[model samples]
Target: GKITFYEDRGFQGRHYECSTDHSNLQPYFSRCNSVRVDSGCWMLYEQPNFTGCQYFLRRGDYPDYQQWMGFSDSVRSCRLIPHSSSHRIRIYEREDYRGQMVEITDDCPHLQDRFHFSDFHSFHVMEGYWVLYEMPNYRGRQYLLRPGEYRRYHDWGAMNARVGSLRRIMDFY
Candidate 1:
């Protein structure tokens, strides 16, 4: 995956190119005013080491930080998502992948109504790519998940433990 970060709006000023996940971006650049995602999907974080508010970004041109609905101009970390198949995920009510759990292999438009659950504290993606929405019916913030175990909200790179909807990423074309 390849992505470029610009220090000024409209893809101007000093810039940095990244082809790998960057845990901390302090040394490269303090803030990101714009971004150009050449290929694949990515998650941009508001704090260093992939912590704090998260923003899901696909291949595109973000002329400014506002384009991603970012609350601030700061962007400290980024992770590129890898493509996969057989989307599967298990959401839990408590951290460390414990407590009440629900496994899903398809899209869930409203998790709260279907599962009678308010929020999810942790999750584990068994395969493929999935997007978690912060609000019901796929509204609010989004967090992309690849095959892995997320023991807590922070493990999924979220500011808080809240999930209301989820969907698998498929090749529509």
Candidate 2:
């Protein structure tokens, strides 16, 4: 069985897609992991319309894409496509991973207007490679990024909360 996200609408994990093009200047891709098209998961929130996914998929980059909203009508219709890189969109995981500040060069000839790199989504000025970890607080969610190797904090709760404050500071200034 797959993980089901039960919010007010009771949508499953099928309808959402991870935001890969980190630079486009629209609402950010809500999650950071990838899913298959066959999977009937809802990719985005539905406050706007059934085509709510389209709002975030601007620039005509994605058309006809739908998230499996876990409604009775579309329940069994969607199936998760096999886990492959081609079908996989970046979905955010509240887990820790070792990532470096590398450039994701878009070599697609069709999207000529897109840039080769993006500083907005992935900040390169932190002065060091960032290591994002999932702090166990707040529903075991959020990417808590540190500048270097993980340190052993005696009070992880306090340390994590401190970093959480730092993230808020980064948000405004």
Candidate 3:
């Protein structure tokens, strides 16, 4: 997983390249305006230690912050998501994997259109990686989900559960 961060847009100015997850990237930039992902999927954080609003990015060149649908130009931390061939996740309406369960293996741009539910309570990612958006169409706060058991919304570092969309991390690019 190789990703390059640039201080200015269009790949100019000071730049930093990384291939592994970093808890903090304070030296890289006060703010990042451009990026290039040469391999692997990534989940970027606005705050250090992988906290704050998250953005999922695949292999591509983002010459502008808006190109990645970024609400802001600041990126403090990042995680290089592991590659996977297949994706699968089990979403529960109640805490601890209880209540009505829904298994999904593909992207759902609008979860409401398929199931009647208020918000996601727990999750069991059986295979691959995924990201959950707070609003429909992959907008708003995002959370990265790796293969594991999320006993509660907070387990995924979400202050509250308000899932509107979800997408699996694929090696399409």
Candidate 4:
């Protein structure tokens, strides 16, 4: 069976939900200690089915940018990466932008398991433009965007006009 995952609101920042046999699976803004993994206080998913689970994050405050997955103590837990260079964000796939609003998806295993994101607004600026990339755990799927597709927060967004679905070696520019 295929796990269908998408924003139930037909738009971003509405609510996230998932249905599976793993009864413990849920979605929330797990507050990490640092910037590597700072999800806020909110239930992104209800009592999800996470049985026969290979990994899981414990219910607690999480430090930002931390590694929050994997098997542990016969259960599962979310751990921190400590530093920035620990986990790498890779480009999964990119679609051409022909209009204004574009749908960007990632390859995070959670995506495959039907994960819902509350705040899809987090990134930094690089070089002379804005760079929007996914965390390693979420960099395995494809994203939809237009030439000027963007998610403006305060005053920043990513451009799909210059780069393609996937980032090239030279794309670091």
Measured with C-alpha atoms, the lDDT of residue 98 in candidate 4 is 23
Q: Please report, as a residue range, the 10-residue window in candidate 2 with the lowest summed lDDT.
A: 164-173
> Model 2, 57-88: lDDT tens per residue?
11122211233211122211111212212111
Point out where model 1 deviates above 4 Å.
93-101, 116-119, 137-141, 151-154, 169-173
Name the runs in model 3 displaced over 4 angstroms.
116-118
Displacement of residue 112 (Cα, Å) in model 1 is 1.2
TM-score winner, 1 or 4: 1
Give the higher-TM-score candidate: 2 or 4: 2
* Candidate 1, 1-173: lDDT as tens digits: 78899889999988899999999988988788999988877888888887777777778899988888777788898887777668889888888876788998999999878885655788899988888888877667778787888887776657777788898865323
Error of 4 at 114 (Å): 27
Q: Clash totals for all models, in order?
A: 0, 28, 0, 32
Ranking by lDDT: 3, 1, 4, 2
Model 4: per-residue Cα lDDT over 126-168, one tens digit each: 1111122233332411122212323342222222222212221
Model 1 alpha-carbon miss at residue 94, Å: 5.3
lDDT of each: 0.82, 0.23, 0.88, 0.24
